[PDB]
Design a binder for this molecule. Structure first.
Ligand SMILES: [Zn+2]
Length: 317
């Protein structure tokens, strides 16, 4: 009747660093013993242990106080589905290719990941330190060329699944949310001919992102925005303290000039499907399109996001 019990030792984890010794019954599934369980991204919840599994590390969900703390300390989230979504993505991104293109880690196109490739390429050209150890650790590996965990983390943090259409501005917003931008400061002035002037200070992520124009110069000169009185008012940059700025707008034909920006994202398509490309300004203009690379002296296209170097700026207005 009853089969002789066989067991193996395995380790469970939520961060792949702190291991937790377990003894599993090879006649029960992982799911029956751990809840949802993953082996390097693969869902083994419904798998019964193999001898080859002995000594291997499995991710589980934070189901006790020790794992909850380890997971928060490593990822800076308490979203219950986070680890599941991170493993589900990782099962895909570990099969993506990450070619070095013009010295930067890119991503060969798959699974609508073009927005991720230009986000990744952008990160490697701006000064940014992540706060979660998971992002620090994974970004370091991504810079070295092994970007699978980093890309799966971006998907998890953004609540995007592999293959879902993503927006670069929104993705960067999530990444900046988890970065140290505390010393970034922006002072704006808005001037209405009827209502007068109103100055506003922004900090952190809101200090480095602007939605409305791609041109940093235009933002220094002034952009027209609605005023509550019904007139159009003029908003201009008074003071900026940050290592970069990101200027974003709905996709519009726009000319990129060598040496006047750091990098940019281009979006061809519509609200339901499209394709992002990346433009970086080095010795010439390089267009990185996943694994593909072209160059040109001028660039014009439907640009959505442009990144600029900064340190300290003060208006003369
Ligand atoms: Zn007004």
């Amino acid at each position: 009747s009853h089969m002789e019990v066989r067991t193996i030792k395995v380790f469970t984890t939520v961060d792949n660093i702190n291991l937790h010794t377990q003894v599993v019954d090879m006649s029960m599934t992982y799911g029956q013993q751990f809840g949802p369980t993953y082996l390097d991204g693969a869902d083994v919840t419904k798998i019964k242990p193999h001898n080859s599994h002995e000594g291997k590390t499995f991710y589980v969900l934070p189901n006790d106080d020790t794992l909850r703390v380890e997971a928060f300390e490593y990822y800076h989230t308490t979203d219950p589905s986070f680890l599941g979504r991170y493993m589900s993505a990782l099962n895909h991104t570990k099969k993506w290719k990450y070619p070095q293109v013009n010295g930067l880690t890119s991503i060969k196109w798959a699974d609508n990941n073009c927005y991720l490739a230009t986000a990744l390429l952008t990160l490697q050209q701006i000064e940014l330190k992540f706060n979660p150890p998971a992002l620090q650790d994974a970004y370091y590996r991504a810079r070295a060329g092994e970007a699978a965990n980093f890309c799966a983390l971006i998907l998890a943090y953004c609540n995007k699944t592999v293959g879902e259409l993503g927006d670069v501005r929104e993705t960067m917003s999530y990444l900046f949310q988890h970065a140290n931008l505390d010393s970034c400061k922006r002072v704006l002035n808005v001037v209405c001919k009827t209502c007068g002037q109103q100055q506003t200070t922004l900090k952190g992520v809101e200090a480095v992102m602007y939605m409305g124009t791609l041109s940093y110069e235009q933002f220094k000169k002034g952009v027209q925005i609605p005023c509550t009185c019904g007139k159009q008012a003029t908003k201009y940059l008074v003071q900026q303290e940050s290592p970069f700025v990101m200027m974003s707008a709905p996709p519009a034909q726009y000319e990129l000039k060598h040496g006047t920006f750091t990098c940019a994202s281009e979006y061809t398509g519509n609200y339901q499907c499209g394709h992002y490309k990346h433009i970086t300004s080095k010795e010439t203009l390089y267009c990185i399109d996943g694994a593909l690379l072209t160059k040109s002296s001028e660039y014009k296209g439907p640009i959505t996001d442009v990144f600029y170097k900064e340190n300290s700026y003060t208006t003369t207005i």
